[PDB]
């Protein structure tokens, strides 16, 4: 689909506690990942527009992570 | 392979649909989001596998995903996610 | 090559069917690939007998008659 | 109520199965599209029988492959099984 379900399954099985997966789980994650990509990109773009820029930069994504509690789990993934 | 990621092109196009057509995205920025998405999936997975494993079940199901979403702060995602499942059923 | 969601919907036209496993549409997708390929190839034999280059519905109905595997299709494709 | 796989997808598989000079009539693609749905429904209903008799609820791989061999498509079972081992 828009995101490959087979690749989502592989990310799921990085966890030792996962080795058989249900039919709906990778499908749920496909839509969730699309919504998440959209949410994070949108939040970083708001900082881009506030600074009247037209190129979304990694700096902006790191910024959006700091300003929303929903993205707390991403604090050590993109550092400053 | 520990760490695996969705293809950069799939991630990039979803990003492009989430901003005006006049916007541009830096290479690092897409790769950054590509990494975050894998982290997001592993994050949610690790809670669901616990909830699942604790009902001595062997497979993560829809409920465990949406249950993990609400627990970890993504409760706003649960409302559309249920809509998505309806159409394919 | 084939969308699994549509294959799942075809499966659930059977009313004695209501829940499906993850693997069933993946089996049917590949099985459908083999079936389309076999039926087309078998029909192409008659396309060649008439030294034509266009496979026609005539050819597929013909192939259905000449293989026991396609018996369930005799009322689906009449000549 | 009756569902068919997209005619373009069916046409693509058909075209790879014929010589490079071959063409397919509009009639032929649509005909095969109907046959393929019939093939899926055919195998499904036997699988649901095998499924139900072992008081199972969900049709699994084995029920399909049993239905394949039972209904004359035993030649499919070995490739399908190998195909259902590389993705797993």
Residue numbers in the entry:
A (entry chain D): 41 to 120
B (entry chain C): 52 to 140
C (entry chain B): 42 to 120
D (entry chain A): 53 to 140
Study authors write:
The transcription factor (TF) NF-Y is a nuclear protein that binds the CCAAT sequence in promoters with a very high specificity. NF-Y is a heterotrimer formed by evolutionarily conserved subunits: NF-YA, NF-YB, and NF-YC. NF-YB and NF-YC form a heterodimer via interacting histone fold domains (HFDs), while NF-YA provides DNA sequence-specificity to the trimer. The NF-YA subunit, once associated to the HFD dimer with its A1 α-helix, recognizes and binds the CCAAT nucleotides via its A2 α-helix and the following Gly-loop, inserting in the minor groove of DNA.
In this study, we demonstrated that suramin, a polysulfonated naphthylamine derivative of urea, inhibits the DNA interaction of NF-Y with the CCAAT box by binding the HFD subunits, either as isolated heterodimers or in the complete trimer. The NF-Yd–suramin co-crystals belonged to space group P212121 and diffracted to 2.7 Å resolution. The refinement converged to an Rfactor value of 22.2% (Rfree = 27.4%), with a final model composed of two NF-Yd protomers (identified with A/B, and C/D chains for NF-YB/NF-YC, respectively), one suramin molecule, one glycerol, one citrate, and 47 water molecules in the asymmetric unit. The suramin molecule adopts an elongated conformation in the (NF-Yd)2–suramin complex, and binds at the interface between two NF-Yd protomers, in an almost symmetric manner. Within the HFD heterodimer, NF-YC is the subunit that provides the majority of the suramin-interacting residues: located at the first turn of helix α1 and in the L1 region, they are mostly apolar and generate the homodimeric cleft where suramin symmetrically fits. Additionally, the C-terminus of the NF-YB subunit, in particular Arg140, provides an additional electrostatic interaction to stabilize a second suramin sulfonic acid group. In particular, the NF-YB Phe139 side chain rotates by about 90° to accommodate the two benzene rings attached to the urea moiety of the ligand. In the (NF-Yd)2–suramin complex, the ligand is located close to the DNA binding region of NF-Y, contacting NF-YC L1 and α1 and NF-YB αC, which are responsible for more than 40% of the contacts between the HFD NF-Yd and the phosphate backbone of the NF-Y-bound DNA. Furthermore, two sulfonic acid groups that decorate the suramin naphthalene moiety, in particular the one salt-bridged to the NZ atoms of NF-YC Lys49 and Lys53, match well with the position of two DNA phosphate groups, corresponding to position −21 and −20 in the complementary strand of the CCAAT box in the DNA/NF-Y complex. Furthermore, the suramin-induced homodimerization of the HFD heterodimers sterically precludes binding of about 10 bp present in the NF-Y/DNA complex.
